[PDB]
Amino acid sequence: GSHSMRYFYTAMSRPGRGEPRFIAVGYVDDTQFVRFDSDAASPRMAPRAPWIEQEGPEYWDRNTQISKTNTQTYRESLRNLRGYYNQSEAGSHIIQRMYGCDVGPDGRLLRGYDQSAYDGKDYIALNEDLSSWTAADTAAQITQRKWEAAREAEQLRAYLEGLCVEWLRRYLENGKETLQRADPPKTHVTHHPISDHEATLRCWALGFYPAEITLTWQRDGEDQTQDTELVETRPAGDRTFQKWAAVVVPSGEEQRYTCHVQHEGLPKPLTLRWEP
């Protein structure tokens, strides 16, 4: 029932290989729905989910304009930040930005976000109160005083409490059949021996949406967190995700081990054993 909209900006300079690239993508929960790449033939906000296609020309024109303005502003900002750190003109650098809103099941704002990084290091973030900034160093303090002068925090609060929540509610309705449908994982347990005395038990989860899931192994009903290999959750390419947890067990002791699965699409949480 809880939901989020996030936009992600990446601005990467490439000295000697043209002007910095600006890329903007939008997600609702784990579903991408829009993209903008300043390297494209015709740079425009483009759809990436069917339920956004129905928006009208004003929408696509406005979002493209914001993104084309952002392209030039992020180029100015990469040069500024290069100055703030006394960096030469030869290296490549990256600004990343993430902002958006979380809403609860009723659709009321839980909290807003706006955070920036430079070359992968935290740089400046809007505080949870949507009205003050946390700067990471004396360079980001310059950005902070520019943003205080620009009433950036105030404009973002208005957006995060207004347009962000309102459009998210609109998107969750227009795409309810997918955005509001949780697909349970298909599960099974496998057994690969490693030696005469030990075997690998692997618990599999496939075809689930959204990506949030809990997979755990237990031994005599007690968690094996230290000993579980948890692969990172991975996209299948069809909107769904995949994951597995693996534990190495003594031969013969397999039945003291249960795999536990929690996912929003599941009627009940699952308990699984190896079934030879």
């Binding site: 939008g26 914001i66 952002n70 600004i95």
Partner: peptide, 9 residues
């Protein structure tokens, strides 16, 4: 919908 273009860093 995107937020409006913010100020340069």
């Amino acid at each position: 919908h995107l937020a409006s273009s913010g100020h340069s860093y």
